[PDB]
Amino acid sequence: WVIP
Amino acid sequence: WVIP
Amino acid sequence: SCIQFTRHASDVLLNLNRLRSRDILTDVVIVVSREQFRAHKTVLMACSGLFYSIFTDQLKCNLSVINLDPEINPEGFCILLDFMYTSRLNLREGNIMAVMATAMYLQMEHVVDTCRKFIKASE
Amino acid sequence: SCIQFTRHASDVLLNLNRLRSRDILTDVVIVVSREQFRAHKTVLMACSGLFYSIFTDQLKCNLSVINLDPEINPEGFCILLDFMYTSRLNLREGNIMAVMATAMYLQMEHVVDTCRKFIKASE
Numbered sequence: 186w187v188i189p
Numbered sequence: 190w191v192i193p
Numbered sequence: 194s195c196i197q198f199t200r201h202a203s204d205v206l207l208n209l210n211r212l213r214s215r216d217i218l219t220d221v222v223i224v225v226s227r228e229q230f231r232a233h234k235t236v237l238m239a240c241s242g243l244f245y246s247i248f249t250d251q252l253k254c255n256l257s258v259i260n261l262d263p264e265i266n267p268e269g270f271c272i273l274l275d276f277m278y279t280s281r282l283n284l285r286e287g288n289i290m291a292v293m294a295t296a297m298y299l300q301m302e303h304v305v306d307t308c309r310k311f312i313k314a315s316e
Numbered sequence: 317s318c319i320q321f322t323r324h325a326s327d328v329l330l331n332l333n334r335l336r337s338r339d340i341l342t343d344v345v346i347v348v349s350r351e352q353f354r355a356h357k358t359v360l361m362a363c364s365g366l367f368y369s370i371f372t373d374q375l376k377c378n379l380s381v382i383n384l385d386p387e388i389n390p391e392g393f394c395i396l397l398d399f400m401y402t403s404r405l406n407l408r409e410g411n412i413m414a415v416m417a418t419a420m421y422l423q424m425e426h427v428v429d430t431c432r433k434f435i436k437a438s439e
């Protein structure tokens with residue numbers, strides 16, 4: 186999971 | 190396009 | 194000896210979401226506590242262990258309406274349906290419990306994992 | 317304020333290809349010079365400007381069989397259908413002309429672009  |  | 198187009202999968206999903214937003218070739222209605230969500234059976238199956246099991250069943254594969262368990266929260270479902278079509282999860286303090294419960298029921302293992310991690314960080 | 321799961325789109329496409337390989341919920345047959353290819357209308361539309369136009373048409377959207385132009389090579393189509401479901405293109409000296417011609421007809425702009433580049437390098 187990432188900060189888009 | 191890339192070499193997978 | 195194949196070549197690969199990096200953005201292809203993302204572009205496919207973006208177009209599938211455009212079809213969903215315009216209600217093009219949607220073939221199922223998911224009913225959650227009277228709220229109704231139109232979607233593509235194939236996308237639901239590709240994202241959820243529960244929908245995969247439902248639509249591979251010889252009788253259920255032909256149903257145009259699926260009713261979820263009454264304990265399922267419509268907002269939690271909506272957030273997860275948005276994630277299915279976009280890879281983006283709108284996870285907030287106010288919805289995390291309903292999102293995790295819905296992802297456990299839908300069998301969306303990666304969503305369950307991030308909810309567990311975010312809850313563990315707040316304790 | 318969404319979070320994003322990097323591998324989600326790739327995982328969705330991988331599962332859609334698993335459904336295709338097991339012939340699950342395929343809803344169309346594409347006929348190419350007597351060869352037949354089963355597929356999902358939504359995936360075809362998501363990858364091709366031609367299928368997008370065909371399946372948004374109020375009469376054609378209901379067809380279970382689509383016949384392609386007789387000039388279309390079945391091997392070129394097969395390679396492109398594989399690319400649609402995997403992001404991988406089996407581009408070879410022996411098939412590049414048939415793949416480019418099929419991608420131009422199917423309106424798959426990124427495939428046309430790489431074929432043009434590979435042909436230009438060989439001249």
Ligand SMILES: CSc1ncc(Cl)c(Nc2ccc3c(c2)CC(=O)N3)n1
Nearest residue numbers: 238239240242245300301302331334
């Ligand atoms: C297992 S083979 C397979 N073949 C095709 C499809 Cl459409 C599919 N979907 C699916 C199954 C289980 C799970 C998910 C999707 C998401 C998750 O967390 N668990 N699986």
Ligand SMILES: CSc1ncc(Cl)c(Nc2ccc3c(c2)CC(=O)N3)n1
Nearest residue numbers: 208211361362363365368423424425
């Ligand atoms: C343009 S809006 C839109 N909405 C939904 C879909 Cl399913 C779609 N597909 C599509 C259209 C045109 C092209 C492709 C896919 C690949 C290509 O090279 N050109 N387009």
Ligand SMILES: [Cl-]
Nearest residue numbers: 255256257258
């Ligand atoms: Cl029904």
Ligand SMILES: [Cl-]
Nearest residue numbers: 301302303304
């Ligand atoms: Cl998931």
Ligand SMILES: [Cl-]
Nearest residue numbers: 378379380381
């Ligand atoms: Cl027909």
Ligand SMILES: [Cl-]
Nearest residue numbers: 424425426427
């Ligand atoms: Cl393309």
